[PDB]
Amino acid sequence: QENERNISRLWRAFRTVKEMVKDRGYFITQEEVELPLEDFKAKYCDSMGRPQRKMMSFQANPTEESISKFPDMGSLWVEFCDEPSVGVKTMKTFVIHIQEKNFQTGIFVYQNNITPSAMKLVPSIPPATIETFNEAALVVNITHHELVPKHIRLSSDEKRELLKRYRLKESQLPRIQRADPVALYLGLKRGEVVKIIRKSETSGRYASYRICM
Amino acid sequence: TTFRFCRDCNNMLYPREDKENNRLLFECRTCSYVEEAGSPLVYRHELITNIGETAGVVQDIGSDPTLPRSDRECPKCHSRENVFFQSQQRRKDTSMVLFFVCLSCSHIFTSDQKNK
Amino acid sequence: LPHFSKDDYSPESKGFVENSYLRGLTPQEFFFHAMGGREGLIDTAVKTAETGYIQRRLVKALEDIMVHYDNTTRNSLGNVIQFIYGEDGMDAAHIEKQSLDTIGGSDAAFEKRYRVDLLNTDHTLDPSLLESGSEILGDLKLQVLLDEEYKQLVKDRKFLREVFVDGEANWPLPVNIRRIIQNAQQTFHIDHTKPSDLTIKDIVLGVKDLQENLLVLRGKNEIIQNAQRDAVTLFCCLLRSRLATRRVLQEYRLTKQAFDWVLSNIEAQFLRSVVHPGEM
Amino acid sequence: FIKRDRMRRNFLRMREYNEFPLRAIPKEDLENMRTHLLKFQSKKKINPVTDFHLPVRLHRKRKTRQLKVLDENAKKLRFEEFYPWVMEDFYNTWVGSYEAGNSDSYVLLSVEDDGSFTMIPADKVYKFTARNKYATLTIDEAEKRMDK
Amino acid sequence: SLMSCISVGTDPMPIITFLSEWGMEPLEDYVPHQSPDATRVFVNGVWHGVHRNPARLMETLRTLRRKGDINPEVSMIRDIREKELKIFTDAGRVYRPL
Amino acid sequence: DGPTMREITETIAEAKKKVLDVTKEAQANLLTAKHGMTLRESFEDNVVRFLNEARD
Amino acid sequence: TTFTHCEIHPSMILGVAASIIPFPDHNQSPRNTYQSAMGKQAMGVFLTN
Amino acid sequence: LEPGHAADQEQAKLIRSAIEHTTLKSVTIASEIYYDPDPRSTVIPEDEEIIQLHFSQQSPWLLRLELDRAAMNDKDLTMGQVGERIKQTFKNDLFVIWSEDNDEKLIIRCRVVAEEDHMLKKIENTMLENITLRGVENIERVVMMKYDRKVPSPTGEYVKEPEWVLETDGVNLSEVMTVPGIDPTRIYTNSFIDIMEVLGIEAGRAALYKEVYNVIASDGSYVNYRHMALLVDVMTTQGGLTSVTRHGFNRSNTGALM
Amino acid sequence: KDQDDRDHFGKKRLDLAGPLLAQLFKTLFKKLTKDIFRYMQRTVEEAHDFNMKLAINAKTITSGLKYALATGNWGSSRAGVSQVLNRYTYSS
Ligand SMILES: [Zn+2]
Ligand SMILES: [Zn+2]
Structure with missing residues (x-):
C-alpha cells in the first residue's frame, strides 16, 4: 500500500x-x-x-x-x-x-x-x-543517469595548477551554477572547479572544467 | 431545466425548499408567486450528448438538393425510399453513422446496427 | 467543391489525383492540385525567410570563436569554450568514415582475427608467413608481447562497446588507414606465398612508438599530456585495431619496406589533419 | 483536333351573407382630433382599463450667429414628444414608448351602432407596460452594491 | 477568373417591398414560442423578419430574378438546414455564370 | 506498356476497394482506433496510407 | 441526381495569364504560377497604336 | 522499463496505467443534483440496497453521477478507492456511497452533514476537475510502442532486440523518473529544459545535442559532429541554457559594438 | 456549429474604383462643406461682401483626387491602390 x-x-x-x-x-x-x-x-x-x-x-x-x-x-x-x-x-x-x-x-x-x-x-x-x-x-540518483558524466572536485592545488598551465584567470572558465543539482549533489562552493570526464564519441574521452559560480 | 415561470409576473420559478412540509417550492423572485416541487430532482449536468442528432428534420426534409441517396426500407412502412445525412452533432469525436429518413412517412432510421 | 454532395469523403472528392501528368487533369483534380502546389510555395517563401534570418543569428553568436595556438577554443574575451577543439583537435576537411573492426562481430571471430599463439597451438600462427616464424613457435620473450597487446585490444573493446552503445562500427576519423595500406601493397608488390621479413618485435614496438608521435598537443605538463592521451584515445583504438599483428602479417603481408613507409606516412598525414589555429 | 472558324460558311448556309356598408369618416373631426392605438404587454387576457382601477389619468410624464443641424419636422415633433405616456390611479401604473414599425398602413373598422362601419386611419400606436408592480428599485443602491 | 464580374449592387427597397406584400410577417410581431419553424429572412445582414413557407417563396424569388424583374446581381441562399434565408444586393461581391 | 497500364488501374482499384471497405467499417460503428487517436484521425491514417502506398 | 447547374466550361476557371499556357492540365501547378508571372514581362507588341 | 522487465508487455501495462493522468471527470458520465430529504433512505428506488448494504443527521442534497463501465475498465479502477480518495481528499464529512463493481450502474453519491445546493456545485466541480484518480499530472495517452535495441548477443555480436517503450505527451520529468518499474538511468525527454533543471547542465548540454542532431537527421542531410557539438557548447558555457537571441548573448559582456 | 472560417471567399467584397472614389469623394466633400461655412461665417461675422468664388475653393476636390490617384496614398492611412499601368505586353 x-x-x-x-x-x-x-x-x-x-x-x-x-x-x-x-x-x-x-x-x-x-x-x-x-x-x-x-x-x-x-x-x-x-x-x-x-x-x-x-x-x-x-x-x-x-x-x-x-x-x-x-x-x-x-x-x-x-x-x-x-x-x-x-x-x-x-x-x-x-x-x-x-x-x-x-x-x-x-x-x-x-x-x-x-x-x-x-x-x-x-x-x-x-x-x-x-x-x-x-x-x-x-x-x-540523478548521477546514475546516462547523461551524467562523472565530475570531481579538485584540490585547489590542482585547480591552482590548471590555470598556470593554460594561462587563465578563474573568470573566463566555463561555469556551472551552485543552483544546478550536480553542484548540490556534490555540495559545491564558489570557485570549486570540476573536471568532467565525458565519454565523447569523437575521441572516446573528453574532459572539461566548470567553475561553480 | 424544464422550469416554470411566474404568473402575473412570468418570471423564472426558482426552487425554494419548504422546511415545514419538508419539500421544495418554486417562486417568482420578482413577486410573491411561489409553487411546490413536482419532481424530486433539482438540477443535473448531463455531460454526454446523443440529443438533437436529428436536427433540421422536417416533413419538408426531402426537398433539400444535396443529400445523396440509397434504397433501404422504412423499418415501419417497409417503404424503400428515403434520404440520408450524418450526425447533426457537428462535434469533433462523433462517429460516422448515417441518419436516414423515409420519404414515404419521413420515418427516421439510422444505419448503425449496434443499438437502435 | 459543390460539384459533389456532402459527407463524400471519397478519395477523389477529398482530393486524390488518379491520373498522371501524361494523361491530363480533370477540373476538380486540377483545382485540387493547385492547392497543394501553392502550399509548397508559401512554405518555400517563409521557410527561406526563417532560415535566412535564423542562420544570420547563429553567425553573430559564434561570430569570433577562434582556435588559438594551443588547440583551445575561446571567444575574443578569452572565455574557453572548448579545451581541445572539436574535442579532438582534428580539422574537419581531413575526416573520412572508417570502420572499427574491433567492435563488430563475435569474440570467436574477434579471437579468430586477432588471437596469435606460439607456445600452444590453438590459433597457431603459421610460420610460413615470415622468416622467423619457424623458430618463433613456442618462444617466450614474444608470446607475452602477444598476450600484452591482445589484452589491450580487448581493453579497447570493453572501452568502445561502452562509448558507442549500439555497436556502430563506422565513424568519421582522421587519416584513412585503408588507403595507406593499399598504396603500400601497390608500391612494393606484395608478392604473396612468401615469408616476410618482419618480426613480432618489429610490429608491436614500431606501432607503440608510432602512437607516441601523433602529437596533437605540444606541452610537457601532466595537464597538457593528459589531453594527449585523451585526444587520440579513439584514433589509436582504430589504429591498433587495424594493425593487429596477425592482420598485418596474415593479410596485408607487409615487408620491412612497406611497414616503415606506412608508419612514417600515418604520422605525416595525421600531422596535416591537425586543426589549424586561427580558423574561425 | 484543330481550330476551325469559317463555319459562318456553314451557319449562313445551314441557315348566407350580410352586407355591412362603410364610410370614410368625415375629415374635420380628424383635423381637430388626434387618436392613437393602445397596446399592452400585461399578458393579462384582456386587461380592461375598466377593471384596471380608478381613477385613470393617462398623460405624458444678442450673440452672434450659429449652425443648426437639420431635421424633418415630424422627427423634431415626435422626438420632442419624448415624454412617455402614463396612466395611473393616484394602484397600478402603465407607460409605453413609440414603435415606428407598424403605424403606416392601418385603418380601423369602427363597429358603429349600425352593422355598418367607418374607416379611420391610424395616427399612432403605443405599448404601455405595467411597472413597479412588485416595486423594487435600487437606482444606485444595487449599483454600488453591484461592484462586489 | 475570365468569367467573373462584381455585383455593383442596388437599392434593396423593392425587394423588401415584395416580401412585405408576400407573407414575410414583420419582425416585431414575431412570437417564436408559438411559431417554432419560421425561416429567418436576412437582407444585407439586416434580419428584417421571418416566414413560414419559404419553398414557394424561394422559387417565386428565383423567377422574379430570372424574369429580370429582380436584378440578376441578387444572390439568394436558402439554408434549408438553418431555416435561414439570406439575400444580398451588395456592391462589391463576386459572381460568375452557370 | 499498355498492359502495365492495366495493372496500375488494378492498383488504383484495390485502393478504392481498400478505401471503400474501410469506410463502411467506420459507419458500421465497427471500427477501433487503437489507443491514442480518435476514431476519425485513425480513419485518416488508415486511408492516406492506403493511397500513398497504392500510388507508390 | 439533383443537379441544379452545369458549369459553362471548366477551363473558364483560369485567369488571363493561365489560359495562355498550352495544356495547363498536364503540367505541375507551380510551373503555371511561374508561367503566370513570366509572360507579363515577355516582350511583344503591347498596343498597335 | 526495468531491464529485466524490458519487452515485458504486462509490466508495460502495469506501469501503463501508473503514470497516465486520470481525472475524475475524464471518465464520469453525467452528474445529477437532487433532493433526498432523508439522510438514510434515498429518494430514487435503486440506491437503497446500496444504502443499507452500507448502512448494514445529514444534508438532503444528494449528489449523483455516473461512470461508464468501459472507461472505468479502460483505466481499470474500483470506486471504493475512488471514494477513499474522495473521502481522504475532503474528510470523513462527506458521506460517499458507491455502487459496487458488481453493479452495472456505476453510481456514486454523497451528502454533507443558506442553500447548500450551490457549494455542491462548487463542490462537484473540483471533484470532476482537480481530483486525479491516478497517474501523474500533465500526462495523458500512455502510448505503447515497440522498438529494436541492438544489445550485444551473449556471443559478441549485437542483435536487434525488440522491446516495449512508453511514449507520452506532456512533461513532468521530476515525477515520472521516480515511478516504480521504469529505468531512470535511461529516460529521455522531448524538451531539454527540464533535463537541465532535473539533471544538471552537462546532461542538458548532452540532451541538447540529442535534440539538434535529430532535426538534421530527420531531414536526411549530415553535418559533422564537430559543428553542432561546438554550438551546443556555446549556449551552456554561461552555466544554464542560453538562447541565441537578443536576450541570449547581447546580455553578455562581450564587446559593445559586437 | 463550427468556428466560422473568416476566409470563405463569400465574406469578401471588392471595393472597386466606384466605391473607392465614393470614400475619397464623400470625405473630400465634407472638406468643402466645412470651409464655405467657415468663410460664410466670417463674412457675416464681419459683414463682408458675399462672393461665390472665394466662398468655394474648387481645388479642395480637384487637388484631392488628382493627388490621391497620382499616388495610392488614400487620405495617409492606405497605399498600394494606384499603380502605373503595366503596358509590357497585351496580356500584362
Ligand atoms: Zn411574479
Ligand atoms: Zn416509412
Whole structure:
C-alpha cells in the first residue's frame, strides 16, 4: 500500500544518500550502501510498520584518502525529519547537535519543506555549513543517469595548477551554477572547479572544467 | 431545466425548499408567486450528448438538393425510399453513422446496427 | 467543391489525383492540385525567410570563436569554450568514415582475427608467413608481447562497446588507414606465398612508438599530456585495431619496406589533419 | 483536333351573407382630433382599463450667429414628444414608448351602432407596460452594491 | 477568373417591398414560442423578419430574378438546414455564370 | 506498356476497394482506433496510407 | 441526381495569364504560377497604336 | 522499463496505467443534483440496497453521477478507492456511497452533514476537475510502442532486440523518473529544459545535442559532429541554457559594438 | 456549429474604383462643406461682401483626387491602390 509505497521511496532515498556522501569522499562500505529493502524494514521500520527517520540518520567520516587530499574534510552528519514540515526549534536541535558534535558540515533531508524562518537559521555557523534536500528528489540518483558524466572536485592545488598551465584567470572558465543539482549533489562552493570526464564519441574521452559560480 | 415561470409576473420559478412540509417550492423572485416541487430532482449536468442528432428534420426534409441517396426500407412502412445525412452533432469525436429518413412517412432510421 | 454532395469523403472528392501528368487533369483534380502546389510555395517563401534570418543569428553568436595556438577554443574575451577543439583537435576537411573492426562481430571471430599463439597451438600462427616464424613457435620473450597487446585490444573493446552503445562500427576519423595500406601493397608488390621479413618485435614496438608521435598537443605538463592521451584515445583504438599483428602479417603481408613507409606516412598525414589555429 | 472558324460558311448556309356598408369618416373631426392605438404587454387576457382601477389619468410624464443641424419636422415633433405616456390611479401604473414599425398602413373598422362601419386611419400606436408592480428599485443602491 | 464580374449592387427597397406584400410577417410581431419553424429572412445582414413557407417563396424569388424583374446581381441562399434565408444586393461581391 | 497500364488501374482499384471497405467499417460503428487517436484521425491514417502506398 | 447547374466550361476557371499556357492540365501547378508571372514581362507588341 | 522487465508487455501495462493522468471527470458520465430529504433512505428506488448494504443527521442534497463501465475498465479502477480518495481528499464529512463493481450502474453519491445546493456545485466541480484518480499530472495517452535495441548477443555480436517503450505527451520529468518499474538511468525527454533543471547542465548540454542532431537527421542531410557539438557548447558555457537571441548573448559582456 | 472560417471567399467584397472614389469623394466633400461655412461665417461675422468664388475653393476636390490617384496614398492611412499601368505586353 501507500505506506508500503512510501517505504521503498524512503528505502531508495536512503540508498541514494549513502552514495552521495560516498562521492564527496566519505567511508561507506559497498554492501552497506546496498542493503535490500527487506533489511531496511527490520532495521528502521518499527514493529507496527512505521520507519524511524530519527534512528535512521547517521554520521559520516571521510575515508582517510579523502582526508589525504583535503586536510579540511571533516566528519559529516546527515539528518532527515519526522515532521512532514520542519519546525525551527526542531532544527535548532540539529545545528547545535552539530555544534556539540561539531561536524565540519551536515546535511538535512526534510520530506516536504521547512518553516521559512529556519532557513534563516541555516547560514548561521560559519565555517560549518548545512545542506538541505527534499527526500523526494533524492529518490533517484540523478548521477546514475546516462547523461551524467562523472565530475570531481579538485584540490585547489590542482585547480591552482590548471590555470598556470593554460594561462587563465578563474573568470573566463566555463561555469556551472551552485543552483544546478550536480553542484548540490556534490555540495559545491564558489570557485570549486570540476573536471568532467565525458565519454565523447569523437575521441572516446573528453574532459572539461566548470567553475561553480 | 424544464422550469416554470411566474404568473402575473412570468418570471423564472426558482426552487425554494419548504422546511415545514419538508419539500421544495418554486417562486417568482420578482413577486410573491411561489409553487411546490413536482419532481424530486433539482438540477443535473448531463455531460454526454446523443440529443438533437436529428436536427433540421422536417416533413419538408426531402426537398433539400444535396443529400445523396440509397434504397433501404422504412423499418415501419417497409417503404424503400428515403434520404440520408450524418450526425447533426457537428462535434469533433462523433462517429460516422448515417441518419436516414423515409420519404414515404419521413420515418427516421439510422444505419448503425449496434443499438437502435 | 459543390460539384459533389456532402459527407463524400471519397478519395477523389477529398482530393486524390488518379491520373498522371501524361494523361491530363480533370477540373476538380486540377483545382485540387493547385492547392497543394501553392502550399509548397508559401512554405518555400517563409521557410527561406526563417532560415535566412535564423542562420544570420547563429553567425553573430559564434561570430569570433577562434582556435588559438594551443588547440583551445575561446571567444575574443578569452572565455574557453572548448579545451581541445572539436574535442579532438582534428580539422574537419581531413575526416573520412572508417570502420572499427574491433567492435563488430563475435569474440570467436574477434579471437579468430586477432588471437596469435606460439607456445600452444590453438590459433597457431603459421610460420610460413615470415622468416622467423619457424623458430618463433613456442618462444617466450614474444608470446607475452602477444598476450600484452591482445589484452589491450580487448581493453579497447570493453572501452568502445561502452562509448558507442549500439555497436556502430563506422565513424568519421582522421587519416584513412585503408588507403595507406593499399598504396603500400601497390608500391612494393606484395608478392604473396612468401615469408616476410618482419618480426613480432618489429610490429608491436614500431606501432607503440608510432602512437607516441601523433602529437596533437605540444606541452610537457601532466595537464597538457593528459589531453594527449585523451585526444587520440579513439584514433589509436582504430589504429591498433587495424594493425593487429596477425592482420598485418596474415593479410596485408607487409615487408620491412612497406611497414616503415606506412608508419612514417600515418604520422605525416595525421600531422596535416591537425586543426589549424586561427580558423574561425 | 484543330481550330476551325469559317463555319459562318456553314451557319449562313445551314441557315348566407350580410352586407355591412362603410364610410370614410368625415375629415374635420380628424383635423381637430388626434387618436392613437393602445397596446399592452400585461399578458393579462384582456386587461380592461375598466377593471384596471380608478381613477385613470393617462398623460405624458444678442450673440452672434450659429449652425443648426437639420431635421424633418415630424422627427423634431415626435422626438420632442419624448415624454412617455402614463396612466395611473393616484394602484397600478402603465407607460409605453413609440414603435415606428407598424403605424403606416392601418385603418380601423369602427363597429358603429349600425352593422355598418367607418374607416379611420391610424395616427399612432403605443405599448404601455405595467411597472413597479412588485416595486423594487435600487437606482444606485444595487449599483454600488453591484461592484462586489 | 475570365468569367467573373462584381455585383455593383442596388437599392434593396423593392425587394423588401415584395416580401412585405408576400407573407414575410414583420419582425416585431414575431412570437417564436408559438411559431417554432419560421425561416429567418436576412437582407444585407439586416434580419428584417421571418416566414413560414419559404419553398414557394424561394422559387417565386428565383423567377422574379430570372424574369429580370429582380436584378440578376441578387444572390439568394436558402439554408434549408438553418431555416435561414439570406439575400444580398451588395456592391462589391463576386459572381460568375452557370 | 499498355498492359502495365492495366495493372496500375488494378492498383488504383484495390485502393478504392481498400478505401471503400474501410469506410463502411467506420459507419458500421465497427471500427477501433487503437489507443491514442480518435476514431476519425485513425480513419485518416488508415486511408492516406492506403493511397500513398497504392500510388507508390 | 439533383443537379441544379452545369458549369459553362471548366477551363473558364483560369485567369488571363493561365489560359495562355498550352495544356495547363498536364503540367505541375507551380510551373503555371511561374508561367503566370513570366509572360507579363515577355516582350511583344503591347498596343498597335 | 526495468531491464529485466524490458519487452515485458504486462509490466508495460502495469506501469501503463501508473503514470497516465486520470481525472475524475475524464471518465464520469453525467452528474445529477437532487433532493433526498432523508439522510438514510434515498429518494430514487435503486440506491437503497446500496444504502443499507452500507448502512448494514445529514444534508438532503444528494449528489449523483455516473461512470461508464468501459472507461472505468479502460483505466481499470474500483470506486471504493475512488471514494477513499474522495473521502481522504475532503474528510470523513462527506458521506460517499458507491455502487459496487458488481453493479452495472456505476453510481456514486454523497451528502454533507443558506442553500447548500450551490457549494455542491462548487463542490462537484473540483471533484470532476482537480481530483486525479491516478497517474501523474500533465500526462495523458500512455502510448505503447515497440522498438529494436541492438544489445550485444551473449556471443559478441549485437542483435536487434525488440522491446516495449512508453511514449507520452506532456512533461513532468521530476515525477515520472521516480515511478516504480521504469529505468531512470535511461529516460529521455522531448524538451531539454527540464533535463537541465532535473539533471544538471552537462546532461542538458548532452540532451541538447540529442535534440539538434535529430532535426538534421530527420531531414536526411549530415553535418559533422564537430559543428553542432561546438554550438551546443556555446549556449551552456554561461552555466544554464542560453538562447541565441537578443536576450541570449547581447546580455553578455562581450564587446559593445559586437 | 463550427468556428466560422473568416476566409470563405463569400465574406469578401471588392471595393472597386466606384466605391473607392465614393470614400475619397464623400470625405473630400465634407472638406468643402466645412470651409464655405467657415468663410460664410466670417463674412457675416464681419459683414463682408458675399462672393461665390472665394466662398468655394474648387481645388479642395480637384487637388484631392488628382493627388490621391497620382499616388495610392488614400487620405495617409492606405497605399498600394494606384499603380502605373503595366503596358509590357497585351496580356500584362
Ligand atoms: Zn411574479
Ligand atoms: Zn416509412
